[PDB]
Structures are given as C-alpha cells and as structure tokens.
Design a protein around this ligand. Structure first.
Ligand SMILES: O=[Se](=O)([O-])[O-]
Ligand SMILES: [Ca+2]
Length: 279
C-alpha cells in the first residue's frame, strides 16, 4: 500500500533514503495487534482514530486528554493519516495530568496496569506499550518497565530530550526495553535527542505532524514523537508474524537502516527504524 504526501517520518520508516514523501506498508497495517499509549490520554473521538482508540484507565478526574501530547503520540502509532500501524487497536492509559506531568508512583501503577489489562483485551497478533515520558534515574521505574516487557509486551520508551547520555534517565535507562532516540528529516540526530549505549534505535522525532486535541493536527518535536514510530512499527511487524513482543526491538535493530545518521556520538548505535516493506 502507498500513502501519498505522507508525513516525512512515515515516508522515512519505509525508505532506504531520506527525502521522499510516500509511505509504503503492507495492508495488514497492524490489524489484530494492540498498542497501549501510556501518556496524557487519547482524544478517542478524533476522526483520525476511526473508532479504534479508547481510554482504558486514568488516575485523574478525567480520562480526557486535556494536553494533546498523548493524542499526538497515539496518532503517530495508529491514526489513519499520521500513523504507522493504521489498523491497530489503541488503548489509552492516562498516567500524566493535563500539564504533562506525573508522579513516578502513578507511572509505575500504569505500567503494571497494562501488564494485567492486556489479559482483558483481544490482541492475537501481540501487544505493544509506548512510553513517551521519563524523568531522572529510578530503579523502581526501570523495574516496572522491565516487568511490563517480561510480561509479553513490546515496550518502547523515549530516550529523553536532554542532549545527554540516557543512562541518567528512566525508563530510558532500563536495558530490557526498546529505548528510542530521535532523528530529523535530513538524517541528523535531533538536536535535543539523548544518546548513549542504552539506545536501541532512532526514529523520526523532529517536526512530526500528528493528531491533536479538539479534532486538530499539529507538528511537534521530541523523542516522544520518535517512540510511537517504533511502537507502531513493532505492532505492524508483529501482525506480519515477522517478530514477537520479546524479540521485536532486536528485530527492528537487525533490520534498521545502518550508518545513515549524522552527529551520532561514538558508542551510540547508528540505526534508523525501517519496515523493509517490499511490494
Ligand atoms: O514534511 Se512534513 O511531514 O509536511 O513536515
Ligand atoms: Ca534495550
């Protein structure tokens, strides 16, 4: 399948070159998979989600996304126009308040929620969790992410936006999850992206168009935007039967575009997420 005039990041993840504008992907499109977006919520009524998004948990007075961040991330996972996996099921877990903040204890509860809640859902092709969030190093946050992964969920987490080594941030620094850095449309490391040995992969993160609250769209930047590209890619590849939740990060690294990013510090992987879709 071909989506013309796609956002650059979608085109990038189906290309061996920068500078194209068509996203190519297998029609299965993540059908039968599930992606949990653990964030500020999801505006499930947005037409872009086509009834495939729902809120499943909140720790606050509403499950509404009063911020936009979670809606944007969910759109990159699975919206019809802006998403990688255009037929996946999206589940929102609101661990972040409408200012975009959340206590680590709430974030931990939300991860253990997903590990159990997947047993309440129909996800025959597998389960992914996208965590476009983080703070300073915490062994308990890392352990929660490790449990979620161990439970059979492909966990993708943002590396962080400090232009620093991700070893000092959580859940970025948890080794067993998929830690995602950000690149731009010219195949440069995004200016803000964290780096370091713990990164597994890069995805598009600078100037990413996606859904926003109030039925709208906007372009924003962050490792928060790179993460859902990888989460959606995992869901897509799991639906194709190419990999599994336990193995998807490694598979994505195996199959990535290699050596094509600039300003990658010595000791950080030079790997850009790629679907290897051949029609
Ligand atoms: O190239 Se794009 O996706 O319009 O910023
Ligand atoms: Ca890892």
């Amino acid at each position: 399948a071909a989506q013309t005039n796609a956002p650059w990041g979608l085109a990038r993840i189906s290309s061996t070159s920068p500078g194209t504008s068509t996203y190519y992907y297998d029609e299965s499109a993540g059908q039968g998979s599930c992606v949990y977006v653990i964030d500020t919520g999801i505006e499930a009524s947005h037409p872009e989600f086509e009834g495939r998004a729902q809120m499943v948990k909140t720790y606050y007075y509403s499950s509404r996304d009063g911020n936009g961040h979670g809606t944007h991330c969910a759109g990159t996972v699975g919206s019809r126009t802006y998403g990688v996996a255009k037929k996946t099921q999206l589940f929102g877990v609101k661990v972040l308040d409408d200012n975009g903040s959340g206590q680590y204890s709430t974030i931990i509860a939300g991860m253990d929620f997903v590990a159990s809640d997947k047993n309440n859902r129909n996800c025959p092709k597998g389960v992914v969790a996208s965590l476009s969030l983080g703070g300073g190093y915490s062994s308990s946050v890392n352990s929660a992410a490790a449990r979620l992964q161990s439970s059979g969920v492909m966990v993708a987490v943002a590396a962080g936006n400090n232009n620093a080594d991700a070893r000092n941030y959580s859940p970025a620094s948890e080794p067993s999850v998929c830690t995602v850095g950000a690149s731009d449309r010219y195949d440069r490391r995004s200016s803000f992206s964290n780096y370091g040995s713990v990164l597994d992969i890069f995805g598009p993160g600078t100037d990413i168009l996606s859904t926003w609250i109030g039925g709208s769209t906007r372009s924003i930047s962050g490792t928060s935007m790179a993460t859902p590209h990888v989460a959606g890619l995992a869901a897509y590849l799991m639906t194709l039967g190419k990999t599994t939740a336990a193995s998807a990060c490694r598979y994505i690294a195996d199959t990535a575009n290699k050596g094509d990013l600039s300003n990658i510090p010595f000791g950080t992987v030079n790997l850009l997420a790629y679907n290897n879709y051949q029609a």
